[PDB]
Amino acid sequence: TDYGTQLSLFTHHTWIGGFCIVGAGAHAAIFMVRDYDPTNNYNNLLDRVIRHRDAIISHLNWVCIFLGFHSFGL
Amino acid sequence: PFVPPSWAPSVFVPLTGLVLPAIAMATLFVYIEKEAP
Amino acid sequence: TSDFMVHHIHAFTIHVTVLILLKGVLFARSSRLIPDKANLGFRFPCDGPGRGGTCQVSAWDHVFLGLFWMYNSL
Amino acid sequence: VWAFSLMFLFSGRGYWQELIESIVWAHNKLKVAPAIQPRALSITQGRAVGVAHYLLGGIATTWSFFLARIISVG
Amino acid sequence: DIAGLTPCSESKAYAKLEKKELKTLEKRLKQYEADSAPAVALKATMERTKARFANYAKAGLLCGNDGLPHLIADPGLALKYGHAGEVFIPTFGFLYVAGYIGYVGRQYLIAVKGEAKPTDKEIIIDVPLATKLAWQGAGWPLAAVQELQRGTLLEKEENITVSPR
Amino acid sequence: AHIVKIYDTCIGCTQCVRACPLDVLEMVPWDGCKASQMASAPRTEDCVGCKRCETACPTDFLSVRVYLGSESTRSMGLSY
Amino acid sequence: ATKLFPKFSQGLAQDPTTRRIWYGLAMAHDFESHDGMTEENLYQKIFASHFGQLSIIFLWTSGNLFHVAWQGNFEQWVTDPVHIRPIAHAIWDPHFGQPAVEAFTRGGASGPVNISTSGVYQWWYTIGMRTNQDLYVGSVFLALVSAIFLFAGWLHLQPNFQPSLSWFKDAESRLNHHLSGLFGVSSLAWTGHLVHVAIPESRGQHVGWDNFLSVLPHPQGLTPFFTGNWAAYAQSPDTASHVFGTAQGSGQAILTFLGGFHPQTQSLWLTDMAHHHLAIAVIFIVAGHMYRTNFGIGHRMQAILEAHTPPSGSLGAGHKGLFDTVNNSLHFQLGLALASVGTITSLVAQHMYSLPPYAFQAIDFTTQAALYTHHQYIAGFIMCGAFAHGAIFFIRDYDPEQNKGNVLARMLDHKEALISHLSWVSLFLGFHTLGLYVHNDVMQAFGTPEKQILIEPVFAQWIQAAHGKALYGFDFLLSSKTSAAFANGQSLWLPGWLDAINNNQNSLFLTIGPGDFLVHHAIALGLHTTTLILVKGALDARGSKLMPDKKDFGYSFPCDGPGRGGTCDISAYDAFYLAVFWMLNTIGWVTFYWHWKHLTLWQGNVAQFDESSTYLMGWLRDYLWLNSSQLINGYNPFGMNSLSVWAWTFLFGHLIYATGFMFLISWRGYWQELIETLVWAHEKTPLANLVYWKDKPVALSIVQARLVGLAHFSVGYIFTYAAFLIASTSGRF
Amino acid sequence: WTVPTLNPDTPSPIFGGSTGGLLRKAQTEEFYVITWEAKKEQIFEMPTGGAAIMRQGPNLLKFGKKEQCLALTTQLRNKFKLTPCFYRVFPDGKVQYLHPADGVYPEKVNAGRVGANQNMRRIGQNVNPIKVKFSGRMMSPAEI
Numbered sequence A: 001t002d003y004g005t006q007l008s009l010f011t012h013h014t015w016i017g018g019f020c021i022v023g024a025g026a027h028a029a030i031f032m033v034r035d036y037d038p039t040n041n042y043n044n045l046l047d048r049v050i051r052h053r054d055a056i057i058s059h060l061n062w063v064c065i066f067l068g069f070h071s072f073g074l
Numbered sequence B: 001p002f003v004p005p006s007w008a009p010s011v012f013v014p015l016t017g018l019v020l021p022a023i024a025m026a027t028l029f030v031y032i033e034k035e036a037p
Numbered sequence C: 001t002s003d004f005m006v007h008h009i010h011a012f013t014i015h016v017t018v019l020i021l022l023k024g025v026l027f028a029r030s031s032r033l034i035p036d037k038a039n040l041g042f043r044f045p046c047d048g049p050g051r052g053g054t055c056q057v058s059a060w061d062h063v064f065l066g067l068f069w070m071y072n073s074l
Numbered sequence D: 001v002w003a004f005s006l007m008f009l010f011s012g013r014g015y016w017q018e019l020i021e022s023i024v025w026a027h028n029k030l031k032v033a034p035a036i037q038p039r040a041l042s043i044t045q046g047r048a049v050g051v052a053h054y055l056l057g058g059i060a061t062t063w064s065f066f067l068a069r070i071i072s073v074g
Numbered sequence E: 001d002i003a004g005l006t007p008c009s010e011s012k013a014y015a016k017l018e019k020k021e022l023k024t025l026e027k028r029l030k031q032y033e034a035d036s037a038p039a040v041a042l043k044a045t046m047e048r049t050k051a052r053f054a055n056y057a058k059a060g061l062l063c064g065n066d067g068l069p070h071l072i073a074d075p076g077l078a079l080k081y082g083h084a085g086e087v088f089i090p091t092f093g094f095l096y097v098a099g100y101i102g103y104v105g106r107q108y109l110i111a112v113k114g115e116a117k118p119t120d121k122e123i124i125i126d127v128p129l130a131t132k133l134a135w136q137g138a139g140w141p142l143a144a145v146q147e148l149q150r151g152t153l154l155e156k157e158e159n160i161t162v163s164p165r
Numbered sequence F: 001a002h003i004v005k006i007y008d009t010c011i012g013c014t015q016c017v018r019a020c021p022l023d024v025l026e027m028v029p030w031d032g033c034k035a036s037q038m039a040s041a042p043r044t045e046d047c048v049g050c051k052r053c054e055t056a057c058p059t060d061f062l063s064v065r066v067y068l069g070s071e072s073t074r075s076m077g078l079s080y
Numbered sequence G: 001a002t003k004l005f006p007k008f009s010q011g012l013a014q015d016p017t018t019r020r021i022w023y024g025l026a027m028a029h030d031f032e033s034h035d036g037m038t039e040e041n042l043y044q045k046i047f048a049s050h051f052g053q054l055s056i057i058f059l060w061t062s063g064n065l066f067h068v069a070w071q072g073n074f075e076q077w078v079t080d081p082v083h084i085r086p087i088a089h090a091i092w093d094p095h096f097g098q099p100a101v102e103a104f105t106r107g108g109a110s111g112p113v114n115i116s117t118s119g120v121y122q123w124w125y126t127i128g129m130r131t132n133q134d135l136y137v138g139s140v141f142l143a144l145v146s147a148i149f150l151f152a153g154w155l156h157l158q159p160n161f162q163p164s165l166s167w168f169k170d171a172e173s174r175l176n177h178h179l180s181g182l183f184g185v186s187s188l189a190w191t192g193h194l195v196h197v198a199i200p201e202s203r204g205q206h207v208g209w210d211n212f213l214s215v216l217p218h219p220q221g222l223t224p225f226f227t228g229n230w231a232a233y234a235q236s237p238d239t240a241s242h243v244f245g246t247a248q249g250s251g252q253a254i255l256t257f258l259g260g261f262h263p264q265t266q267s268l269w270l271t272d273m274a275h276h277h278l279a280i281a282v283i284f285i286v287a288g289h290m291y292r293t294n295f296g297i298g299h300r301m302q303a304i305l306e307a308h309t310p311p312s313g314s315l316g317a318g319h320k321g322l323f324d325t326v327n328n329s330l331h332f333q334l335g336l337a338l339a340s341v342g343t344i345t346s347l348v349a350q351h352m353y354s355l356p357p358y359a360f361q362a363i364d365f366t367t368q369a370a371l372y373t374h375h376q377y378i379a380g381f382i383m384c385g386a387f388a389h390g391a392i393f394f395i396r397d398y399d400p401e402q403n404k405g406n407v408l409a410r411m412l413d414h415k416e417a418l419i420s421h422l423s424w425v426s427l428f429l430g431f432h433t434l435g436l437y438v439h440n441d442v443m444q445a446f447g448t449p450e451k452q453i454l455i456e457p458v459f460a461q462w463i464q465a466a467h468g469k470a471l472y473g474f475d476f477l478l479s480s481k482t483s484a485a486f487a488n489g490q491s492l493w494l495p496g497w498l499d500a501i502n503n504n505q506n507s508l509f510l511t512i513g514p515g516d517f518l519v520h521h522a523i524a525l526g527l528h529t530t531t532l533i534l535v536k537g538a539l540d541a542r543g544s545k546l547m548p549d550k551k552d553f554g555y556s557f558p559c560d561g562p563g564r565g566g567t568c569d570i571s572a573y574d575a576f577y578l579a580v581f582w583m584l585n586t587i588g589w590v591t592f593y594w595h596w597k598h599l600t601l602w603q604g605n606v607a608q609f610d611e612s613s614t615y616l617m618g619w620l621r622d623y624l625w626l627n628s629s630q631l632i633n634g635y636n637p638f639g640m641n642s643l644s645v646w647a648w649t650f651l652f653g654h655l656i657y658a659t660g661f662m663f664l665i666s667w668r669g670y671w672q673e674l675i676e677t678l679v680w681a682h683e684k685t686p687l688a689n690l691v692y693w694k695d696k697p698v699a700l701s702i703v704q705a706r707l708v709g710l711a712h713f714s715v716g717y718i719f720t721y722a723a724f725l726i727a728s729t730s731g732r733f
Numbered sequence H: 001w002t003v004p005t006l007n008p009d010t011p012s013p014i015f016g017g018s019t020g021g022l023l024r025k026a027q028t029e030e031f032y033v034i035t036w037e038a039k040k041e042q043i044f045e046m047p048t049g050g051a052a053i054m055r056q057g058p059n060l061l062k063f064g065k066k067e068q069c070l071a072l073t074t075q076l077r078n079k080f081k082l083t084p085c086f087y088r089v090f091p092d093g094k095v096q097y098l099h100p101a102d103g104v105y106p107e108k109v110n111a112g113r114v115g116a117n118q119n120m121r122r123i124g125q126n127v128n129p130i131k132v133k134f135s136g137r138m139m140s141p142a143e144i
């Protein structure tokens, strides 16, 4: 029944979640730059991801363009 | 007089909007990619 | 219909934020533009105006852009 | 604050460094130049300041709008 | 009077504005009891409003057609029609405090400049010297004028860095 | 191609050559400094313009300067 | 390999990327930067460009005349210029449905048409146009003139017709001919048109090419001019009951100085305008005989410049050598011309809204708002261009050895002091204006509007009282009836001028209060900050402590790299780039002030502006939020009306502005890496790798990015404000 | 000293392959080949992404641009203390030795080198742009 509390709580928790997600990506990049060592990641999942990162980024870029067109064009 | 006909917009607007820009775009695009001897 | 359109808008914005963050994570060590990005660290402004311009190539700048996209999405 | 962010996001530290040099000349004329040499914000710092102000301004704008509206009619 | 304005003591819009403010405060006060904290707070606010309006009308301020006071920035008009307290006296007051702060900071910088490590004296404030200069800055206009007459206030052209033109 | 120039204020500290990421600069013998060396740019056709050499130069003002010129495949650092 | 485009730069032609097209398009007018460019060829290319621009201007004017004569309602608007809206041109859009066709069908037309806001109807009606035949003849004449100018531009580039280099540097002859011929003779011809056509047409007498050689403009017929009794020309002027376009109450005078405005049209008298053009024509013609060209008599600008050095040595060498550094530098002349043009444009905007020159122009509120805003934004852009070209002059054409000790070298000698004082003025104005606004906002929020600081603008009100306004009560100069300045004009122009300035129903010296004082301080802040950025960029263009050799890098370059802490936006081009935002913000403040004050005046409630212009909440709610209710309602689920195009334009400008923010915030590197990934994706895709690009795809350069973001920002800004202004003014009235 | 000859039948490090490899430029314009001698097998980082294992003895690799080859050269010299060298290979089969140019690395001074693009003056002694104006094309005051 307290609409103010409901709206404020949803908005606040959503913003905290989004900020924490961006921070997660930031620390993933920090690990990749500082703590990553190729001598212990020869043929694991992380090495293969780095190997086909171009394909990953290209497909994600295309799906972003497709979603943008079919979402904003409407 | 100098007054255009009644059908003049129905012919000049599609011309200036589709005929002239397509010809101009194709001509300019061909000109830009011309290789020097 | 309005709910469908706004849900697709949310999906598109989430995908773009993921694209910026994942691009900054995968291409944090190296890229086709700068092969020794890991030597420059995680947070550096650029690599000079060379190669046409290398402004915002660090992973930190990717986090910086992801912040704007997260703000837009949320 | 949000519009203030646009000052740090659309400009570069070279202009600010030269402007600071002119201000430093004004200080040196009246013998009021500090020993700590005033230097403009770094490129990364400028980007961080801009994104921080952009986020704070936009989030606070939406916060005021939501709270005032939901408290008045809710 | 000046610029077609009327004094606030004889303006109808001024009195109507005061009655409007007192009316909304009294209307908000009617919903509470008589010996409760919100009622006492509202009565205190109403008394503050009455005192503020009485003091503004007593000061001889000039009001406009909106019922709000106006300030006279011209020194001649202010000193000729009794409006020097609006913008003249506060101007000189700010000039005194501004030059006061500026002279205290300048004296501290020049004092720590001849030391071994001035940067340490800049990030870590020397409280005794700063306090002494803060107390001695009361004679800032006299000291500044004496410095200007001696030629020691400014630095020479040859000792200042400039661009290569 | 970009224009890379070396001025007479070069002290022969060899820091600009080590900071060059595309092997454009080198050291040649000289008689104007104590180190008796001087920086040279004989492969400017491969320079991209990163200005890492300018960052690594310790003289005031700089001894090595980079001027952006005509862009090409090597100057733009394109792998395609 | 090397491509044909561009033909003026072999280095850009050898570029195998997409940067070649963008750079070739952006450097086509940079004649000094082409391959194999000399001074004579440079001047000839500029001459041809000038002719082409003149042809474009004349053809555009002819197009406007033709469309008004064809799809406009000028023949019906002249009969009722108060209750009939002007028509710009028809609309032929196959995308329009039935509601759009009937929604845009207005103004007495037979189909969808656009209602004009340019004000050409009032101007053409005032100068003498009455029928559509006149507009058609004018359009044909202007089209032929444009064709002649285009042919002249082509002819002057061919051999035996190209002017010599010394011909382009004949400053004395060119200035004498422009002051006497282009300025004096043109003004004299306009006086002849006003006396022979405009004045008789406004009195109900049709005078055209078929009968102007037999109709006398005055009953005395050139006799008082030759006999020196010019006072007979001002006899029997138009009375106070004159009806424009008819002979009811029309006088017989052709050159008067009654002043004020016409009682019906609320515009300037035609006789006064003709007299004005005659006087300025005589002055300009006389001024055209000041410089020595080929007859011994006259002056030499070099001698006057070299003979203007103070003996005390305060200005150093004075103006010695200024003739050579200006005559040999095209950027200096262009900067001076742009500075004067921008100032004159602002003067035009102010004088046209305050003193309406065209008939039935004051009643058209949309025309006033659009014209003032258009001229002010154009003036702002032109001023920024003047300062930009000044910086270009310092980098490319400044010679310290030739300008040794003169005023020009002394400008760079104390540039730090200038930038520091400009910084102090901008800081003081910004802190005080923002502080007073926030203080008034807090007082209005706390329910105490009497506690806000409202400084009365006694200086500008004192000036208004000097002009003759008795509302304030200073009673001096033209305000006091016993003054010599007042009694000396009571027989020539003061009656009409005083009657027009004391009337509060016009835009002639409107009443001002604390809100006007505060917004004027905001205007001063914007002007000083824009001047600070431009002046600092022009003086620091040749070098500073951060970049001692900036003059060797040209006017526009990306940066000096991340070394020395960072050198982002260090060039003079970047200073201009940052100054464009301040120019747009300053013009935005002046146009907001103009629109709100005039809206409250036209609505009959100036107290609303006087009471809400002191706090920013009043500006945001009572002006931006209150006047956009009809604009955003152009199209909604309940249907649409003729105001839907402005709503679409509003959202269009918002989208362009936000798109510019992308190029302004995100920088090259991220985009180049993304492009590389896309290149790999296209190269490794079957059925699509067969179609390969001819130019290697690369990210936009830093300078190109700044220009693209600035262009989107300015376009969105302009379109958004123009749409809001026209929609609010048209819906409200 | 003698200019090395490229050996195409040289073993390459064991790498699983990646998407940051060569493109159509390697077949249409040019590419680069880096060769080095390794004393023992060791896992190193590829400049285009991924971890490869350099074999014992000769090792050959292909890259799209010279920056990738010099980056790998710097990594091998500073992390494993090796002596790598690279060439530029054209689609017609022409091989051009690039680094080190004289067999000696450019950080140390070597006899026989001739300084080029050197100005026997300082920056403050450069001429004004007005003196280099109206030239054949856009010329900077430092180009002379």
Ligand code: CLA
Pocket (backbone or CB within 6 Å): A019, A020, A021, A022, A023, A024, A026, A030, C042, C043, C060, C063, C064, C067, D052
């Ligand atoms: C569990 C959460 C967490 C933790 C432990 C860390 C820890 C760390 N982060 Mg990180 N980060 C996080 C979340 C977290 N982060 C989130 C949620 C984001 C998204 C915004 C980021 C984005 C981020 C970036 C981009 C960077 C780091 C960096 C770092 C490292 C250096 C510390 C630092 O930031 O400098 C000191 C901390 C500060 C100076 C505090 C800044 C204060 C802000 C600007 C004020 C916030 C405004 C406030 C809420 C409103 C006040 C109103 C005002 C009027 C007073 C450190 C290991 C840096 C790094 O990698 O080091 C190399 C780095 O560059 N972080």
Ligand code: CLA
Pocket (backbone or CB within 6 Å): A060, A061, A062, A064, A065, A066, A067, A068, A069, A072, A073, C016, C019, C020, C065, C068, C069, G655, G658, G659, G660, G661, G662, G663, G665, G666, G674
């Ligand atoms: C409203 C302004 C604006 C717009 C339109 C865009 C648009 C876009 N951004 Mg962007 N961005 C913005 C602001 C904006 N951004 C700002 C301020 C920042 C700074 C933080 C960024 C930072 C940013 C990043 C970091 C990235 C993007 C990316 C993208 C692209 C995503 C692909 C997509 O959405 O598919 C569709 C395209 C659109 C929705 C754009 C509008 C297209 C219109 C609606 C279609 C109209 C077609 C019309 C018929 C054309 C006819 C023309 C006629 C005259 C002939 C897209 C083109 C991402 C990318 O590169 O792509 C994956 C990317 O990673 N942006």
Ligand code: CLA
Pocket (backbone or CB within 6 Å): A069, A070, A071, A072, A073, A074, G095
């Ligand atoms: C991107 C979002 C979007 C979408 C989904 C639509 C959709 C539509 N629009 Mg619209 N439009 C858009 C954006 C969009 N528009 C924008 C941004 C504008 C403003 C500039 C307009 C302006 C506009 C106008 C003026 C009109 C439309 C109209 C239409 C309708 C018909 C168009 C048509 O027939 O063209 C033809 C389409 C094609 C030939 C190609 C279709 C794409 C195919 C299906 C994809 C194939 C890929 C496939 C999956 C590949 C498989 C791989 C392999 C295995 C084979 C249609 C339903 C018309 C209308 O109103 O209808 C009533 C019309 O008059 N639009």
Ligand code: CLA
Pocket (backbone or CB within 6 Å): B004, B008, B009, B010, B012, B013, B016, G056, G059, G060, G061, G062, G063, G064, G066, G089, G090, G091, G092, G143
């Ligand atoms: C610069 C002035 C100008 C402008 C802005 C317009 C604008 C317009 N005209 Mg108009 N026109 C003009 C001059 C102009 N005209 C002149 C001088 C004539 C007399 C010959 C005409 C004759 C004319 C007719 C008969 C019609 C229009 C129509 C229209 C509308 C449809 C779009 C169009 O371009 O049609 C076509 C425009 C033309 C045929 C005129 C082009 C002829 C000139 C000499 C060419 C100029 C070349 C140009 C400067 C080169 C650069 C442009 C570009 C390549 C970069 C549009 C609003 C149509 C309409 O009413 O829509 C409802 C229509 O039927 N015009």
Ligand code: CLA
Pocket (backbone or CB within 6 Å): B013, B014, B015, B016, B017, B018, B019, B022, G094, G095
């Ligand atoms: C500036 C000039 C211009 C002109 C004159 C038109 C004209 C037209 N557009 Mg179009 N459009 C334009 C610009 C223009 N558009 C731009 C810039 C965009 C991007 C924003 C679009 C996007 C757009 C969309 C999405 C659609 C249209 C459609 C249409 C048609 C309206 C359908 C109708 O109700 O009539 C009746 C329809 C007919 C009588 C059928 C006529 C068939 C075609 C149009 C003519 C014959 C083809 C011709 C031989 C080839 C010409 C190509 C030439 C350049 C070589 C119409 C003929 C709609 C459409 O295509 O209809 C299906 C529609 O879907 N337009």
Ligand code: CLA
Pocket (backbone or CB within 6 Å): E074, E075, E076, E077, E078, E080, G458, G459, G462, G474, G476
């Ligand atoms: C910061 C800029 C500034 C501006 C724009 C003005 C503007 C004005 N001042 Mg002024 N004034 C200023 C600074 C300024 N003042 C400063 C710094 C001082 C301190 C020295 C004064 C002290 C001052 C005095 C004493 C008077 C004014 C007066 C005036 C008003 C008319 C006189 C005039 O224009 O000549 C410029 C003003 C001066 C050069 C100062 C000397 C006064 C001159 C000689 C005017 C006196 C003649 C007479 C009294 C005029 C009144 C005529 C009629 C109304 C009776 C006018 C609106 C007069 C006034 O209206 O009285 C209320 C007046 O007497 N001012």
Ligand code: CLA
Pocket (backbone or CB within 6 Å): G046, G047, G050, G051, G054, G167, G168, G170, G171, G173, G174, G177, G178, G180, G181, G182, G183, G186
């Ligand atoms: C009497 C002889 C004469 C005349 C009439 C002209 C006329 C002209 N010359 Mg020229 N010139 C002359 C002699 C003459 N010249 C001589 C002897 C030399 C050699 C020494 C030159 C060398 C020369 C050069 C090098 C150039 C010109 C140029 C021009 C054109 C300037 C274009 C322009 O700015 O628009 C006209 C400007 C005005 C009419 C003045 C406007 C005054 C203000 C700004 C406006 C105020 C008016 C009013 C309020 C606005 C009206 C409102 C409403 C009706 C819209 C112009 C048509 C340029 C050119 O060639 O263009 C092709 C140029 O490059 N001339």
Ligand code: CLA
Pocket (backbone or CB within 6 Å): G025, G026, G027, G028, G029, G030, G031, G334, G338, G381, G382, G383, G384, G385, G386, G388, G392, G555, G556, G573, G576, G707, G711, G715
């Ligand atoms: C009499 C006026 C005049 C003249 C003759 C010049 C002449 C010149 N200027 Mg200049 N300038 C002017 C006014 C003028 N300017 C004004 C008013 C400004 C302020 C805006 C500037 C600011 C300026 C800068 C910053 C620079 C120049 C430069 C130059 C030189 C060559 C560049 C060039 O023009 O290439 C061609 C010009 C272009 C290709 C224009 C760029 C494209 C624009 C952004 C169009 C965007 C509009 C958009 C499409 C509108 C459509 C919206 C709609 C579709 C919704 C040249 C000698 C450059 C220079 O000196 O080189 C070092 C330089 O850097 N000018």
Ligand code: CLA
Pocket (backbone or CB within 6 Å): D003, D004, D005, D006, D007, D010, D011, D019, G423, G426, G427, G428, G429, G430, G431, G434, G525, G529, G532, G533, G578, G579, G581, G582
């Ligand atoms: C709303 C946005 C905004 C604001 C407020 C400013 C403000 C300013 N700009 Mg700027 N600018 C902007 C946008 C903005 N700009 C944009 C988008 C651009 C294009 C990139 C520029 C480009 C630009 C340039 C190129 C220059 C400026 C300059 C200036 C300064 C002018 C001096 C002045 O007016 O003193 C007034 C001072 C203020 C208005 C500061 C605000 C006072 C605050 C609110 C008080 C502190 C609050 C409280 C006490 C403490 C709260 C902090 C808390 C965390 C504890 C000023 C600080 C010029 C300059 O540097 O001047 C020397 C300069 O050269 N601007």
Ligand SMILES: CC1=C(/C=C/C(C)=C/C=C\C(C)=C\C=C\C=C(C)\C=C\C=C(C)\C=C\C2=C(C)CCCC2(C)C)C(C)(C)CCC1
Pocket (backbone or CB within 6 Å): G331, G332, G334, G335, G336, G339, G340, G343, G386, G387, G389, G390, G391, G393, G538
């Ligand atoms: C950078 C540069 C430059 C410069 C520029 C500029 C300078 C700009 C600006 C500016 C401006 C824009 C200015 C203007 C001005 C104005 C003035 C200076 C005026 C005035 C006034 C007067 C004098 C008036 C008087 C009066 C009155 C008061 C009123 C009534 C009438 C009378 C007359 C009485 C150039 C290019 C040259 C070159 C070099 C570099």
Ligand code: SF4
Pocket (backbone or CB within 6 Å): F006, F009, F010, F011, F012, F013, F014, F015, F016, F017, F038, F039, F056, F057, F058, F059, F062, F063, F064
């Ligand atoms: S870093 Fe500078 S001083 Fe040192 S060798 Fe290179 S050019 Fe000479």
Ligand SMILES: [Ca+2]
Pocket (backbone or CB within 6 Å): G128, G130, G134, G201, G206, G207, G208
């Ligand atoms: Ca007629």
